[PDB]
Structures are given as C-alpha cells and as structure tokens.
Write a protein that holds these residues in place. Structure first.
Motif, PDB file in Angstrom:
ATOM      1  N   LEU A 129      -1.927  -0.998  -3.535  1.00 48.54           N
ATOM      2  CA  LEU A 129      -0.795  -1.933  -3.634  1.00 48.54           C
ATOM      3  C   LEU A 129       0.366  -1.324  -4.410  1.00 48.54           C
ATOM      4  O   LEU A 129       0.160  -0.498  -5.296  1.00 48.54           O
ATOM      5  CB  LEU A 129      -1.230  -3.259  -4.299  1.00 48.54           C
ATOM      6  CG  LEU A 129      -2.513  -3.995  -3.898  1.00 48.54           C
ATOM      7  CD1 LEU A 129      -3.096  -4.760  -5.087  1.00 48.54           C
ATOM      8  CD2 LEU A 129      -2.234  -4.935  -2.733  1.00 48.54           C
ATOM      9  N   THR A 328      -5.163  -1.436   3.209  1.00 51.45           N
ATOM     10  CA  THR A 328      -3.899  -2.088   2.859  1.00 51.45           C
ATOM     11  C   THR A 328      -4.049  -3.573   3.130  1.00 51.45           C
ATOM     12  O   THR A 328      -3.745  -4.408   2.267  1.00 51.45           O
ATOM     13  CB  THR A 328      -2.686  -1.543   3.655  1.00 51.45           C
ATOM     14  OG1 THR A 328      -2.341  -0.233   3.189  1.00 51.45           O
ATOM     15  CG2 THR A 328      -1.474  -2.449   3.487  1.00 51.45           C
ATOM     16  N   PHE A 332      -3.973  -6.447   0.159  1.00 50.27           N
ATOM     17  CA  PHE A 332      -2.816  -7.322   0.103  1.00 50.27           C
ATOM     18  C   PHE A 332      -3.127  -8.696   0.669  1.00 50.27           C
ATOM     19  O   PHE A 332      -2.825  -9.705   0.043  1.00 50.27           O
ATOM     20  CB  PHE A 332      -1.627  -6.701   0.812  1.00 50.27           C
ATOM     21  CG  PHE A 332      -0.391  -7.533   0.748  1.00 50.27           C
ATOM     22  CD1 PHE A 332       0.345  -7.615  -0.428  1.00 50.27           C
ATOM     23  CD2 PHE A 332       0.044  -8.235   1.859  1.00 50.27           C
ATOM     24  CE1 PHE A 332       1.505  -8.394  -0.495  1.00 50.27           C
ATOM     25  CE2 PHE A 332       1.192  -9.011   1.802  1.00 50.27           C
ATOM     26  CZ  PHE A 332       1.923  -9.090   0.625  1.00 50.27           C
ATOM     27  N   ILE A 340       3.188  -4.813  -0.826  1.00 52.24           N
ATOM     28  CA  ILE A 340       2.742  -4.140   0.387  1.00 52.24           C
ATOM     29  C   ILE A 340       3.859  -3.219   0.873  1.00 52.24           C
ATOM     30  O   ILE A 340       3.695  -2.483   1.859  1.00 52.24           O
ATOM     31  CB  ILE A 340       2.414  -5.133   1.532  1.00 52.24           C
ATOM     32  CG1 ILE A 340       1.381  -4.514   2.489  1.00 52.24           C
ATOM     33  CG2 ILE A 340       3.698  -5.571   2.263  1.00 52.24           C
ATOM     34  CD1 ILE A 340       1.112  -5.290   3.764  1.00 52.24           C
TER      35      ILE A 340
END
Ligand SMILES: [F-]
Ligand SMILES: [F-]
Lengths: 444, 441
Positions: A129, A328, A332, A340
């Motif tokens: 992040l 990812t 997120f 992000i």
C-alpha cells in the motif's frame, strides 16, 4: 453578465492574506507529519529485517516471525481503524474528496492518530500500500485542524486549507510539488460545480511541505532510473498501443477492487474481530512474501528501477504482475489504511517494461529501449483506473526526470483514459466516494 | 447529495464527437502554427539577405533594414485595422473573452488577418511573440471546425474553443504540458463552472505538438545545458528574486496599459496615422535588429547567452532597459503579436543579473548565475500575467533543469504574492476588462 465580469476580472487573484499565511502553516505541518510517517514506516520495516536475522537459521521459524510481525502490525492497524475511525480505512483520497464536496466530515481529533498509527501498522508491516493514502487524508485533516483552531470563517478558506493539506500531502509523499498542486486541480476539487480554491495558496502549502521533506530526505531519490534514450516520431504509434492496453485493463482492474471489497466484506460481516484477524492474515502473507518473493509485496518502488533497466526476465515480469495484482487487491480492497495510488506505479512499470521487451525483439529497425516503455507505463494505470492522466504524467516526470519521453508519456496515458472511458469504466476514487455516499442513504 | 452520487458515476464521459473533433483542431492548429513559424523565419531571412546585397554603404544598409521592417510592419497593422480589429495586440484576452461568451470569434476574418498580420510584424523583427497569433488562430480554428460541422452544445463551444488555444501555445513553444495548463489556470472562465473536457484539450495538444515535431525535430528553441543544483541554504535568495519580480510586475503592467493609451493619442484611431506609426516602430526593430540584435526580436537568442553568464553586468542592464522600451512600443502599439515570450527574455536577463550579484556576494554558496536566470525566466510571467503554474511548467518544458524546481517555484510564487500585495492585476484579465468596458461605454 458583462458588467459583473469586468468587476470580477479586475478583482482576480486576491486571496485573503489570512488564508495565504495559513496555507503555509498547513504545508509545514503536513510535511513534518509526512516525514515522520515515512521515517516511522521505515523503522518498522527495518526492525522486521532485524528479526529475520536473529533467527536466520531455522527457515520454518524464520518463515513464522516473518508472518507474525506483519500480522501484529496489520491487526493493530485494522483495529485502530474499525474502533476509532472507519473513515480512515481504505485510501484516504475519496474521503478528502468527500470533504471537498461538503459531503463527508473531517474528524481530525480521531483520523490523525488513527491514519498515522494505523498506516504505520499496515505499511510498516510490509503491506502492498502507498503512503499517499495516509498523507493526503492526514494532510487535509491537518488542513481542517488549523481551520478550526484559528476559527477561520468562509467557504474559500475551508475549501482552500482542505485542498492545500491534500496537495501538501501528496507532494511530500513523492517529493513531487507539481503533482500535488496538479492533483488537486484535476482530481481532488469538486468536479461538477464552481469553487473558491486559491491555487496560489495550495502552492504555498505545497512548497513548505516539500521544503520539510527536503530538510530530512535530501540526496537520495525515491526512483533513480537514469537518462534513457529518445523516441523518434516513427516510434510514437507503439505508445498509443500500450495506452489502449492499459485502457481496457484500467476498468477491469477497477471492477476487481470494488468486487474484492464486497467479497472480503462477507468474511467479517462488519465484525471488528473477524476483520482485525483477517487483517493480520493478509498482513502476515505480505511479511512472508516480503521475504520469499519481495517483488510481490511492499511498496514496489525498489523494483521500479530494475524493470526500467531490463534486468527482469519476461517470465519474472509476468510473475510480478500477476502476483502484485493479487496482493494489491488483497491489501487495499480489505480496507486496511493505505493508498492504492503508488502500487499502481509498480504495476504500471512492470506491464510497460514487458511491452517494451516484446517491442524490442519485434522491431530492431526502431532501436528500442524497453525502458522508455516502462516509463510511459508507470503513470498509465493512474491514467486508466484513476483517470487522472495529467497528474500521473507530471508525477512520473517529477520522479523519473526523463522529459524526452513527454510525447510518449502523454500519448500512452491519454490512450489509456480514452479506452477506460470507452469500455465503460469510471474514475476509481469517484466510484468509491459514491458507494460510500450511497450507503450513507441506503441504510435510512 | 443524491445529485452528486449520480454525477460521480457519470464522470469523464466526454461525447465522442467532441473528442474526434479535438484531433482535427489540434492538427489544423499544429499545421497552421508550423506554417506561421516557417513564414516568420523566411521573412527574417530575406531581410538578412538584403543587408548582404548592400553590405558596404552603412547609412544605406541602416535604411533598408528600417524599410524592410517598416513596410512589413505597416502591412501588419494595416490588415488588422482594416479587416479584423480583434486581431490587434496579443490575442489571448480576446480568446479568454470568447470563452466567457462575451467576445465574438470571427474566424473568417481573424485567421487570415492574424496569420499574415503576424507574419509582417514578427517577420519584420518586432519584439513580439508567436503565442498571440497561435493561441488566437487556434481558438479561431476551433470555432471554425465547430461551425463547419455544426456542433451544438455549450460543452462543444467551450471545449473546442479551449483545445484550440492550448494546441496553439503548445505549438508555439513545443510545450504540450504548458498548453494544457494555461487553459486550466488562466484561459478558462475564472469565476464560474464550465464544461470543458480536459481529456479533449489534451488530445488537441498531442496532435498539435506532433505536427510541430514533424517539421521541427532535432532542434530546440532554447538550449541551456544542465545547470548546478540548488542547496537548501541557497533557497532564500530565490525568495528575494521573486520579491523583486513581484514589485516590478505591476509597474510593468501599468506601463503596458498606459503606453496603450499614450500611443492611441498619436493616431486617434485613424488607420493611416496608425499604419504609419506601425512602420516607424517596425522600422525601429529592423534597425535595432542589426545594430544591437539583443534589444530587438523574439528574444530567444540571448536567453542561452544570458544563462551561460556570457553577458557583462552592463550589457545586461542595457539589454533589459532596452527591451522594456521596445516591448512596450511594439505591443502597446496594437501590433498583432503576444507579450508572453518577450517576458521570458526579460525575466531571464533580470535573473542572470541578480544571479551575478549573488555569485560575488556569496562565494560560500558556489553559485551559478544561470540558476537565477532560469528561476527568473518565468517569473515576469508569474508577476504580470499571474499564471505562475503555467510559467514554471513552461520554463521546465523548455529548459529541462528539473533540479531547479524548488527555486523556480519559490521565485515564481514570491512573484505572484508580491504582485498581489502591491495591487497589480492579471494583465490578460486587465486587457479583456478594458475591452469589455470600452464596449458598454
Ligand atoms: F489510493
Ligand atoms: F501577451
């Protein structure tokens, strides 16, 4: 409306000296906050490396404390969010966007310590992040705090010191003053109606911020990529193609994040304990991965210079992309505190790099450096997912200093936004602010 | 609120017709820009070949320099006064006015007038810039394709008017970003919402820029090399320089406004006295353009020489004063041509000069005067025009010294701040104001 205009034209750019001075105060604080957050995140990443050395022999033991150390920081991070500031979950950019629309509250007595320490948990844990999330939201909250504290009245001031905080927040996260200023006046301000945000004031805030980051972070760039080759006019069409590729991937990625948000909400249902636990789970996977495949975890800034240099095999580049899309989304869409934005830079670079490699072998008449394509690709997910191309372009510029690739950057980014539009995707920050505003009405 | 939620879900959905049409504006503006640019240089070239054909008789050669410009100048003021008065001056206030829906875009008249009018004054060697012509021509082309294709809507009239002027600034400086930024910082209606598609202006600037690159690759307008970095303990100097630009900006702004009036006396509005005054001013520029070329012309040739510290302090004081003069004269006379680039040369010279003082005063800083040159280069733009963002990003796009980004921002911002605090105004906005007030009076 003519007579009014003549009056207006003559009264243009006359920001109240109060707002201008306060902009400088917001800047300065946001900057120090950002510097601290950065220094904090780094210290925890480092103590974690110091643990894997205290047990560098017993691989299963080492694979364990790699997991736990993140998990604890993850959990602690999710926990501060769910308990004291739910609005500090996720990125932190829809929330200050909300605040600029006067449709979300800036609860700075809670968000500052929650975003700061909660992010310190997730990022310092080694989760995938970015700092922008925390610093932008933090910055705007600091914006609001000095508003309240000095009781400045006016719509101009509320919007101004709010905006200045976010811009100073983005700038200090990337050492990118132009990108901070631009981000506000391209993405952040309210998109569908007029506002009174002094650009000059956002400016002053941003400067002060950047000077503070400079006092504490001089001499080492976040990304050194060196000076790459040029792009000849007959090479431009290849960038259009790379843009189109991001352009259709943009929206697809956007769905997976929104979708994953939902799918992950099921697992905990809203429950602080399942959620915190699920946080240490994702968190630990990152600390683990951050040891056994460090290019699939963390901020990803390290693997930026490598991909641009050609030091990655197509196989490794395909591996890094797929894995990171996975991590990812996990980090997120799970609602941990953290952006992000920056992880889209790595995904961008990797994908473009790989395109460049295929462009090199298919076209030796061109004299390609796959690195020009990485660099046109770095701000490209920003283009197609966030639909802030003007900002990803200037941000990549400020970080990589390869102005000769301007034409290439602009065309790729643009192609990405066009195809992102045309295949029915929407700006990710706006699509998040929306579902959150719509939940603020569904349960009514 | 529920309005907003439906707005966010519909955001950035520019009508495809507006997008495709941006491509054509950008291209046409790029082409036109290029043609304008090659036209100017050709005429500048001829005048140089006439000074060779008579390179012996000094008082004869001083004459044909004056005359070749004088004639071209006259032909320029003429085409404006006779067919398109809205093509006098810079051309930005006009297009700004247009985007406010308070001025007409008479493209059937402005295109040929601004093109050939610009050709004369610039090609004659006057202290003006191609932006005025290119931004106006570009906006006008934008209206032209809008009409021709009969695109209805406010978004279409505002977008295609905008992408045209961005594309024309981009094309006159090889600064695609500055093009785009000038629209969002200065040109768009400053006091109310507008439906101008940023993505669409972008597309126009790309096509515009590509056109220019097809015909102008391999050579940059300003090369300055790579200058030294700027130490944190060196930053306060840039604050001071911006302060100096900040108090001068407004003063210089008065002077352009006043000289507009004081020259409007000489001819009263009369086409013949005016066109004649034109040839005197243009004649003066072709004359200075040979005896002391630094006092005349676009000003681009001296920027590198100033930045590399290859001028003396005296030669700088001269050049500056000399240009304040030939800048007011050329532009406040109503001649078609921007004041935007002639500020770049002004801003450079002041900077270099400030820089050189800094060097001898602080050898402990290991200074390079060229860094103050580059910080100052967009500073007058910040002070007089009040577009510090566009100034900074323009100079960045032309000088490629990004490690000077802090000093450039600091100086520029110190410029806008002090300009505001000393009662100056956005010169473009002051001119559009003057024109809208002299209208309803
Ligand atoms: F984010
Ligand atoms: F101008």
């Amino acid at each position: 409306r003519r007579r009014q205009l003549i009056r207006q034209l003559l009264e243009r750019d006359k920001t109240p000296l109060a707002i201008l001075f306060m902009a400088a105060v917001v800047g300065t604080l946001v900057g120090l906050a950002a510097v601290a957050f950065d220094k904090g995140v780094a210290w925890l990443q480092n103590q974690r490396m110091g643990a894997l050395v205290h047990t560098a022999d017993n691989y299963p033991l080492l694979l364990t404390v790699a997991f736990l150390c993140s998990a604890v920081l993850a959990m602690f991070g999710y926990f501060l969010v769910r308990k004291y500031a739910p609005e500090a979950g996720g990125s932190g950019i829809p929330e200050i966007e909300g605040a600029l629309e006067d449709q979300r509250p800036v609860r700075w007595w809670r968000v500052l310590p929650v975003k700061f320490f909660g992010g310190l948990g997730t990022l310092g844990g080694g989760m995938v992040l970015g700092r922008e999330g925390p610093t932008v939201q933090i910055g705007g909250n600091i914006g609001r705090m000095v508003l309240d504290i000095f009781r400045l009245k006016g719509d101009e001031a509320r919007h101004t010191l709010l905006a200045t905080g976010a811009a100073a927040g983005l700038a200090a996260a990337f050492n990118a003053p132009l990108a901070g200023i631009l981000f506000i006046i391209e993405e952040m301000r309210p998109q569908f109606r007029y506002t009174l945000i002094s650009i000059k004031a956002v400016f002053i805030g941003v400067i002060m911020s950047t000077i503070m980051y400079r006092i504490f972070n001089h001499e080492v760039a976040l990304i050194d990529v060196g000076k790459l080759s040029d792009a000849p006019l007959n090479t431009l069409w290849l960038y259009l193609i790379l843009g189109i590729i991001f352009g259709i991937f943009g929206p697809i990625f956007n769905k997976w994040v929104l979708g994953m948000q939902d799918l992950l909400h099921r697992v905990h249902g809203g429950n602080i304990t399942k959620w915190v636990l699920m946080g240490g789970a994702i968190g630990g996977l990152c600390g683990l991965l951050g040891f056994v495949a460090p290019a699939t975890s963390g901020g990803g800034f390290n693997l930026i210079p490598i991909a641009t240099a050609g030091n990655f095999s197509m196989g490794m580049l395909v591996f890094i992309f797929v894995a990171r899309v996975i991590t990812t989304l996990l980090c997120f869409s799970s609602g941990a505190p953290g952006g992000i934005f920056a992880p889209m830079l790595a995904l961008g670079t990797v994908l473009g790099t790989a395109f460049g490699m295929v462009a090199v072998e298919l076209f030796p008449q061109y004299h390609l450096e796959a690195g020009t394509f990485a660099i046109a690709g770095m701000g490209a997910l920003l283009a197609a997912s966030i639909r802030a191309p003007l900002t990803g372009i200037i941000l990549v510029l400020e970080m990589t200093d390869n102005y000769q690739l301007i034409l290439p950057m602009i065309i790729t980014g643009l192609g990405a936004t066009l195809l992102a539009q045309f295949t029915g995707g929407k700006p990710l920050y706006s699509a998040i602010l929306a579902r959150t505003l719509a939940k603020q009405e569904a349960e009514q």
